[PDB]
Structures are given as C-alpha cells and as structure tokens.
Amino acid sequence: SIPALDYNPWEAIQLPTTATILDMSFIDRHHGWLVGVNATLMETRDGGQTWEPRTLVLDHSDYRFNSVSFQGNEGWIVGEPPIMLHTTDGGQSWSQIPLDPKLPGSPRLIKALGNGSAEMITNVGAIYRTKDSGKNWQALVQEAIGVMRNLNRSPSGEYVAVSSEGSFYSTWEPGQTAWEPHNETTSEELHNMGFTPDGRLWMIVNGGKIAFSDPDNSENWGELLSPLRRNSVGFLDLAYRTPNEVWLAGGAGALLCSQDGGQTWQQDVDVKKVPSNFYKILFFSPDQGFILGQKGILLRYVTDLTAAP
C-alpha cells in the first residue's frame, strides 16, 4: 500500500445543513459563498472556518444551485430548473435575472468576468456571454452536444467537457463556433477532465487511473498511471494546490496527495474516517482550499504550522 502522508491538512467542518454542496467562490480572502442542493446558500466572513445560511425569496426551494462565481463584489449563481441570481454588493442582496425560455437545457456553470460581463454554459453545452449584467445574452455556441458528465474551465477561458457516456471529451475556446470532439484518445471510460497549471490536460478514467496530456501535443496522452496501484478505488476530482502539489479525491474516503506533479502519491489516511464522498476539490490560493462533500460536511485546508514556505 502507498505511503501515508505525514501531515493531514484537511479539517472537517459540519455545515448547518445536510444538503450536498455543489460549488464555492470567494469575493476575497475572507468573504465567500457556497451553494448546493435545495437552494442551499451560505456565506462566510472568516475565510471559510464558519458559514451562515442565507435564505432567498424564491418562488420555490427545489432549485439545485450548480455554480457560483464572483469577481470582486459582483457575483452570479445559476441552477436548475433554470434560475440565475446576480449581486453587485458581495451578496448583501441578490436579484433574480430572467432567463430566455429558449435556453437549451439548464445552466450548469457561470463564470464572473467582472464589470457586468459573465459567461454561462448549459448542461448540453450551449455557451452564452453577457456584457451588460445579464440584460442581454449573446450565443457563442448553439449547437448542443448532449449532457456533459463533467465540465472544467482553463485560466484562458477554454472549456473541456466529458461526454455523457465517457466515450469522448469535447473542447471549446473563445473564437470557436462549435465544440471540438476528441475521439479514441483512450480506450477507457472517461470520468473527469481539467487543466493543469502548465497548460496540459488531465483525465480521470474509471478504474482509478489518471493521465496527463503530452506537452508537445494536447491530442496525445501519456501512460495511464494508477496512483494506488490497485484498480479497486475510483477517483472523482483532481486539483492543484501549487504547480507541484496535486490532490486526488475518490470513493471510500480516498484522498491522495502528490508532491511531484502526479508521478508519486501518498495517501491521507486521517480522512478515511470522514463519512462523505469527496466529490470536488477547490483551491483558491496555496493556503485556502476546500473539499466539497455530502451531509453538509466540508473539508478545509489548514496550512502546516511546521512547513516554512
């Protein structure tokens, strides 16, 4: 079995809820919001150590809040069935923005660009942009691609979308008028994909394997790596805290850390006790990170008091 990690930086926090949390975003170091199932909406003022519920005046509370994104005090929330909320004062007040009924599918992701601009993607891949605080939306891609298994965004605004059956993945970048399908890269079933901090792609495929794209050609993939060397445990999300430290979350309390960019892995055994699947990792800076779970449990990253840099 792989070596145990020396320090466990992940602290469990019980939110005042049992809803599953789906996304999180910070205005600044201390002031942030998280969202989830059942119109769950909570605020922190102390960097995510403590969270306060916020109730919205909605027509109903069955909304699934999928995505929250801030740029400064300007913030956006989208969910299903189609709903979009906007704030200009860091969430002190939230306004509902009417969506076009002709929107194909429901909003899955929203990205605040600041100064009234935002980009939104539906769960079938329609991409819309606003420059006027949501009054008007330009369609950047209307040719839908079907339900996505996972969707991630690069720093330069590229998107990668895993197809519904994991048979392929699709990419899009500003300028393109349709998603680009990428077929037969792997013989394995794709689960999740995203971007590294050096401009490569990563993928999790079913069976607990991962791979990184070739820096010479993002169409080509390196060897399938098995972080645990056993096929038994599948992974759900991968995220970098720094260019070299990668965290990988999976089923059955699996949480692995690599300090060399994903070649060698150690296991965080202290979190096997925590009763939640770890479905999503978010780092906001090298000292601020969260692992999103079920039953209102949230892991918070706590920097090592004996590590110097």
Swiss-Prot record:
InterPro entries: PSII_CF48-like_dom, WD40/YVTN_repeat-like_dom_sf, Ycf48/Hcf136. GO terms for biological process: photosynthesis. Keywords: Photosynthesis, Photosystem II, Signal, Thylakoid. It holds the Pfam family PSII_BNR. One of its GO terms (cellular component) is plasma membrane-derived thylakoid lumen. It is found in: Cellular thylakoid lumen. A motif (Arg-rich patch) lies at residues 165-189. SUPFAM superfamilies: Oligoxyloglucan reducing end-specific cellobiohydrolase. Its main location: other. Belongs to the Ycf48 family. A factor required for optimal assembly of photosystem II (PSII), acting in the early stages of PSII assembly. Also plays a role in replacement of photodamaged D1 (psbA). Assists YidC in synthesis of chlorophyll-binding proteins. Interacts with the D1 protein (crystallized with PsbA1 or PsbA3), via the latter's C-terminal prepropeptide, may interact with parts of the mature D1 protein as well. A 7-bladed beta-propeller torus, about 54 by 46 Angstroms, with a depth of about 25 Angstroms and a central pore. This is Photosystem II assembly protein Ycf48. The lineage of its organism: Bacteria, Bacillati, Cyanobacteriota, Cyanophyceae, Acaryochloridales. The gene is ycf48.
